[PDB]
Design a protein around this ligand. Structure first.
Ligand SMILES: CC(C)=CCC/C(C)=C/CC/C(C)=C/CC/C(C)=C/CO
Ligand SMILES: CC(C)=CCC/C(C)=C/CC/C(C)=C/CC/C(C)=C/CO
Lengths: 347, 347
């Protein structure tokens, strides 16, 4: 059974999760260095250099599936490395071709489809020589998921989340003036299936990978039901994924204002509405998490997400953002403790 | 309104205590570089390089005296720097002259005696040109303690603990064959005023500086009575200071065996008696700490100190020492958590 008390949970993270994540992550970093195309190589290494925390955090789900610990972490790390690599490729495109963005994000759907034939995902861009990097990441996922006893029960839900994630990455990276019309028209197709929210709130809800890792985790269990697959998806989507990305965008505000970059928080009528809706998402997130198996573990993952995000220098070294962050959610001073602990370690 | 819950306590330590200690400690490092005598300079800088954790730990007492935070920490740092410097000078003496050891440790008594004229503390050794390093550490303590409204009420108790500490440093640093005879004669002078214990248990009890820092902390209060000053002294001496040094000796066993260093645990008739007496010290220490003002603070700091000691790789990587440590004190998974956290940071 998973640790649900802080001390054993933290001990298992430092002893088991982080060394196991880094065993595989550090192997991908060595592979990325051998990418022949200098632009693909740079984007791969930048994602690996800057976004380690995504894999370190995602790997914590390993604790729910000890019998498949190494394999589940290898899947989460391969899938998350792909997301961060592809995000860099889309963010750094000089061409802004949505066919390219889509073709790249179809790699994530291949990763979730064992025996899906691998295509040239780079077919709509000039840079295509990755020495098999992307194919190796896809095949890693394919070969692991197929060994999970209830993968077939969760696969449809994983693909639904991955498709929504890919759609977001396509629409938000096109030429500035075409982004919001695409996102609004895209939201309009899903809004009937969704709780009452805005196009930009929906956009945030689709931008997380947490639901995919949670479904992959429970895929390791014998006799998972279609009913439970659906409970597990609904536990994270839309509310938890929403809070995750609303925080990501909260922390990235000052660089988005300065770099004229798409930030979903900027489409709220005012700050009062933003804080009120954020608090609503948090309450709905707490309610959705409580429906899950191992609810106490999920509530710990979730508190950890909020705390680590709000501990960012961008929040804690900005008097205004720090004040507004405590208005959004009170965390018993954990964000500040993590900032000052971090600040002490690296000096 | 002193922080006692783990998150706010830890946040204050990382935000307030450690950065403030680091600032004053760094200023002492730069001051030490100006020591003219090459050997005194080498010993001052070595103590400062190796023993910063003593000041980091001692400074946590600042949180009991928020009004006097910076001044109390400057006192604690100056006193502890002096202790670790003098320890080095006595350790690395080629002549092992107890007159030298005594004269050096008389600096600690001067530090606790404002308006006292100072001697040449180096008067019994070859190396004497420190450019005022030791005088400035003394004067730093003297100038801070006079500003504490209740210093006069705790001064006698502080001088008592400082005298016994000085006595221990004198007796333990002489030639190997004179150490135990000196330590037994010394204990025999104090035996009748102490709870029942061995000369080597007594030696352990006198070797900590916690009592001095705690007394200095409550010196910052208006209208401390003699009764209260005696309660505060008894809260740390002898049981808490005893646990502190017995635990230090416990962890360093393998080191002290192979470097043939003096270790007071080796004078127990066997391991079983050593563990039995340690458990007794722990109980008396818990009892004496519970008599203090802010008893949850004192309990939390003491458990933190124990957890940090037991997290040492010397304990956690040594199956035998790990078994004995878990007999000696029940800390649950905290030492193991701190071990794996440290292992991760410094991989
Ligand atoms: C009891 C405690 C403190 C538990 C710690 C819980 C932690 C560290 C959770 C990390 C949160 C997490 C899963 C982050 C992953 C980030 C991710 C997948 C980002 C993709 O954009
Ligand atoms: C919260 C942190 C990182 C504290 C660091 C400080 C450490 C490691 C302290 C452990 C030792 C300690 C509390 C010593 C007290 C000072 C003293 C009298 C030392 C002489 O043995």
């Amino acid at each position: 059974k998973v640790p649900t008390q802080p001390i054993p949970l933290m001990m298992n993270i430092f002893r088991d999760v982080l060394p196991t994540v880094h065993r595989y992550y550090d192997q991908w970093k060595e592979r990325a260095k051998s990418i022949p195309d200098p632009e693909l190589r740079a984007q791969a290494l930048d994602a690996l250099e800057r976004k380690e925390f995504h894999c370190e955090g995602g790997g914590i789900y390993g604790l729910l599936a000890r019998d498949r610990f190494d394999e589940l972490i290898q899947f989460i790390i391969a899938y998350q490395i792909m997301c961060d690599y592809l995000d860099n490729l889309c963010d750094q495109s000089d061409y802004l071709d949505p066919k390219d963005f889509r073709s790249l994000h179809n790699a994530l759907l291949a990763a979730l489809t064992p025996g899906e034939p691998l295509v040239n995902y780079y077919q709509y861009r000039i840079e295509q020589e990755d020495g098999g990097y992307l194919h190796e990441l896809i095949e890693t996922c394919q070969h692991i998921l197929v060994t999970f006893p209830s993968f077939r029960m969760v696969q449809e839900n994983m693909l639904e989340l991955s498709q929504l994630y890919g759609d977001l990455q396509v629409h938000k990276h096109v030429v500035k003036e075409e982004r919001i019309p695409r996102l609004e028209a895209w939201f309009n197709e899903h809004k009937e299936k969704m709780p009452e929210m805005t196009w930009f709130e929906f956009s945030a809800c689709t931008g997380s990978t947490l639901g995919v890792y949670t479904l992959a985790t429970y895929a390791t269990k014998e006799g998972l039901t279609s009913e439970q697959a659906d409970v597990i998806k609904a536990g994270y989507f839309p509310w938890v994924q929403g809070v995750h990305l609303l925080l990501d965008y909260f922390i990235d505000q000052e660089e988005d204002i300065a770099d004229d970059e798409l930030n979903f928080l900027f489409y709220y009528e005012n700050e009062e509405q933003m804080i009120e809706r954020f608090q609503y998402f948090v309450q709905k997130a707490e309610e959705s998490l409580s429906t899950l198996p191992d609810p106490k573990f999920h509530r710990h993952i979730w508190r950890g997400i909020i705390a680590i995000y709000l501990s960012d220098e961008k929040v804690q070294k900005n008097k205004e953002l720090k004040k507004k962050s405590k208005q959004m959610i009170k965390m018993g001073g954990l964000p500040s403790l993590l900032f000052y602990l971090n600040s002490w370690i690296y000096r």
